[PDB]
Amino acid sequence: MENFTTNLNQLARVGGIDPLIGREKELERAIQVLCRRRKNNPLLVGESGVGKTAIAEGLAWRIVQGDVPEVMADCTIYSLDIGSLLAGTKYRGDFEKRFKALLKQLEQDTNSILFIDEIHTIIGAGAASGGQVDAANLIKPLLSSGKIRVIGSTTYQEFSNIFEKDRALARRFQKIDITEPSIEETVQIINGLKPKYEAHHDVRYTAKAVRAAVELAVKYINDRHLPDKAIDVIDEAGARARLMPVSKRKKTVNVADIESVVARIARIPEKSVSQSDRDTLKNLGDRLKMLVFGQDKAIEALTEAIKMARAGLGHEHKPVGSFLFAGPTGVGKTEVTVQLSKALGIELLRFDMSEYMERHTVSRLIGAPPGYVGFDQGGLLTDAVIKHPHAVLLLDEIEKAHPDVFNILLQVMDNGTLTDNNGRKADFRNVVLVMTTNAGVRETERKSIGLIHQDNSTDAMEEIKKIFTPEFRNRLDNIIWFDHLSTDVIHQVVDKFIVELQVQLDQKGVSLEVSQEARNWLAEKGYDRAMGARPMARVIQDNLKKPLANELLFGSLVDGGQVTVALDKEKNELTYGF
């Protein structure tokens, strides 16, 4: 069966297979299963990059080395070679004869074990359509009799659809859960192969570089497991140095080369692997002030709370933090959240609580076993916090949330996790919860009764106390007030809009001068203490655009030209042609 299956003891005998590093109990569990009289076929269930193949290889390695129980005893694990069974013929006639001959020889051989790598891929048609579409049917009865012990290989999602598909195999194979190695284990596997990588690329890696490949990859690779990505970083640093005129002089690969390599894929660490674990944040109070003008104490308060969380003050199961942002609309509450997420290098996740106002929508957000989105949404909230674990979560206008939302959030605040309808869990230990609400200032908008009107200003913090429960308040890191905007700020806002208009006019070729009185006026007219600067979008969208758009379109105006609008004494846009 030299062209039907690969002898893996023999492969291990000729290099091929490295000793397995870690997952010793997985190798032993497979042995414990192989030793059973029925339902004695182990299955390795993993995913690429966590050692699922390496374990099967490790079993063969142990055998060639004699590192086996006498209960084995002189076995010989072979890997089904679906390629070789098909190759050279591509027809059922010979695939079938070769496959059946393979099984007959394996059934006949003392203690032969057949490892089928990627067993979840022969579920379709054997190696390929035209080959043994019934390979599974031939295997079912030999497994049932125990003629050939078979070692399976599937992935976590493939198992549930491949073995559970047919009881003739589900009831024969035992499931072994294979998970990834740790940071130091990843370093050990790199160090295990390090001599090869160094030989292969004519480079040398520092101890720090190897650790950095692992320690940094977990912050940037995100989706694929670490064991391979840290290695890809080591191979890319090596390969890059060998290709580029580097390793011929600078054989050594340092952490900086690892940072450059991870950045080649993530584009982060070469500029941002770690600038100021404390200062990029303290500088944020001032960085935010460059875009958000006002609410200075609010941004400083957030900065202090984040700095405290980073100090390690808290618990291992808790979120980074939770804040309620109270105040008028149009004062930059969302602007602060956005600028913080950018500065901190994280994603912003957003939900509008007014859309989670009714009981049904509440279950869709949660991913409650019933009443969830799709089949595994779930859980709009759980998904968002699984895909982006270090993100900032913004919940808008929170007083409009249905009470069940309010309670799921309290449960998350207490334990750091949210369970999906499919049993999967979101990890909130790395996120910041930002909750907003425009209720604390609505009372002061009221006009009183009486011959003399009075001042209806209130303490917005007391209004928050009445609206929200104390269980909720006691779990917040803070309540932060974002106040109304000053005159110079509304000027900064109107100028930002005017500048964008000018950029668009520059693209066309028209120059627009806006007098200072007009700039002030638009800012004062658009701004409404209750809605802040929110309405500024329209005071400009119509006043500085409609009258100009029309001339260009009518044809009196051309691509070039210089137009000014001055505010006159009647507050009427004093426009000119061009």
Ligand X SMILES: Nc1ncnc2c1ncn2[C@H]1O[C@H](COP(=O)(O)OP(=O)(O)O)[C@H](O)[C@H]1O
Q: From residue 527, how far is each of 269, 298, 489 by CA, in Å? A: 42, 21, 10
Binding of ligand AGS by 402 (CB under 6 A): no
Residues at the site binding ligand X, with contacts judged by CB under 6 A: 18, 20-23, 48-54, 189, 193, 227-228, 231, 292-293, 329-335, 485, 489, 493, 496, 532-534, 536-537
Question: Does the protein bind a copy of itself through residue 397 (CB under 8 A)?
Answer: yes
Among a copy of itself, ligand AGS, ligand X, none, partner that 390 touches (CB below 5 to 8 angstroms by kind): none
Count the neighbouring beta carbons within 10 Å of the beta carbon of residue 336: 21
Please report whether residue 400 would count as binding a copy of itself according to CB under 8 A: yes
Q: How far is the CB of 193 from ligand X (least distance, A)?
A: 6
DSSP summary character for residue 400: G
State the nearest-atom distance from the C-beta of 570 to a copy of itself, in Å.
26
CB of 186 to ligand X, least distance (A): 9
CA dist 327 and 289 (Å) reads: 18
Does residue number 232 form part of the binding site for a copy of itself (CB under 8 A)? yes
Q: Indicate the residue among 393 and 485 with the shorter CB distance to ligand X.
A: 485
Of ligand X, ligand AGS, a copy of itself, none, which one does residue 128 interact with (CB within 5 to 8 Å by kind)? a copy of itself
The residue within the footprint of ligand AGS, chosen from 6, 132, 329, 382 (CB under 6 A), is 329
> CA dist 560 to 506, 507, 508, Å?
9, 10, 7
State which of positions 352-371 bind ligand AGS (CB under 6 A).
none
Q: What residue 550 binds from ligand AGS, ligand X, a copy of itself, none (CB within 5 to 8 A, per partner kind)?
A: a copy of itself
Q: Which residue has the tokens 């694929």?
A: 224
Element (H, E) at 364: helix 359-366
- Does position 294 bind ligand AGS by CB under 6 A? yes
Residue from 231, 349, 395, 498 binding ligand AGS (CB under 6 A): 231
**Residue of 1, 17, 20, 103 interacting with ligand AGS (CB under 6 A):** 20
- Closer to ligand X by Cβ: residue 54 or 362: 54
* Residue 269 C-beta: closest distance to ligand X, Å: 28
Least distance CB 189 / ligand AGS (angstroms): 5
CA distances from 74 to 55, 408, 497 (A): 19, 58, 80
Q: Residue 295: what are its φ and ψ, rounded to 5°?
A: 55, 35
471 lies in the binding site for ligand AGS (CB under 6 A): yes
- Under the criterion CB under 6 A, does residue 331 sit at the interface with ligand AGS? yes
Q: Decide if 186 contacts 214 (C-beta within 8 A).
A: yes
Binder among 8, 21, 226, 563 for ligand AGS (CB under 6 A): 21
Query: Using CB atoms within 10 A of its CB, is residue 357 exposed (0-12), middle (13-18) or buried (19+)?
Result: middle
Question: Interaction with ligand AGS in 180-199: which residues (CB under 6 A)?
Answer: 189, 193
363 makes contact with a copy of itself (CB under 8 A) = yes
Classified as helix, coil or strand, 29 is helix
Nearest to 395 by CA among 372, 370, 428: 428
Under rule CB under 6 A, residue 485 binds ligand AGS:
yes
If one asks whether residue 378 binds a copy of itself (CB under 8 A), the answer comes out as yes
Q: Sketch the per residue contact string, 45 through 64, with ligand AGS: x for CB under 6 A, - otherwise.
A: ---xxxxxxx----------
Q: Which x/- pattern over 2-41 shows residues binding a copy of itself (rule: CB under 8 A)?
A: ---------------------------x-xxx-xxxxxx-
Closest to 143 (Cα-Cα) out of 34, 2, 59, 62: 34
- Asked if 281 interacts with ligand AGS (CB under 6 A), we say no
303 binds a copy of itself (CB under 8 A): no
Options 61, 197, 323, 468; binder of a copy of itself; rule CB under 8 A: 197
Closest approach of Cβ 35 to a copy of itself, in Å?
4
Element of type H or E holding 481: strand 478-481
Distance, in Å, from the CA atom of 350 to the CA atom of 159, rounded to the nearest integer, reads 35
Burial 91-114 (b: 16+ CB within 10 A, else e): ebebbbebbeebbeebeebeebbb
For position 22 contacting ligand AGS by CB under 6 A, the verdict is yes
**Amino acid letter, 15:** G
| Helical (H) or strand (E) element with 519 | helix 516-526
Q: What is 65-133 written as a DSSP string?
A: HT-S-SSS-S-EEEEE-HHHHHTTT-SHHHHHHHHHHHHHHHHHSTTEEEE-TTGGGSTTBTBSTTS-T
Could you check whether the bond before residue 16 is cis, i.e. omega within 30 degrees of 0? no
Contact 133, 123 (CB under 8 A): no
295 binds, among ligand X, a copy of itself, ligand AGS, none (CB under 5 to 8 A by kind): ligand AGS
Is 438 a binder of ligand AGS (CB under 6 A)?
Answer: yes
Buried/exposed code over 201-221 (b: 16+ C-beta within 10 A; e: otherwise):
bebbbeeebbbbbbbbbeebb
Return the SS3 of 41.
strand
Residues 454-493 binding a copy of itself (CB under 8 A) are 469-471, 474-475, 477
Of 19, 67, 171, 459, the one binding a copy of itself by CB under 8 A: 171
Q: Does 259 bind a copy of itself (CB under 8 A)?
A: no
Dmax of the chain from CA atoms?
A: 108
How many chain residues bind a copy of itself (CB under 8 A)? 169
Sites for ligand AGS among residues 128-157 (CB under 6 A): 140, 155
The whole-angstrom separation of Cα 326 and Cα 328 is: 7
In the complex, the residues that contact ligand AGS under the rule CB under 6 A are 18, 20-23, 48-54, 140, 155, 168, 171, 189, 193, 227-228, 231, 292-295, 329-335, 436, 438, 471, 485, 489, 493, 532-534
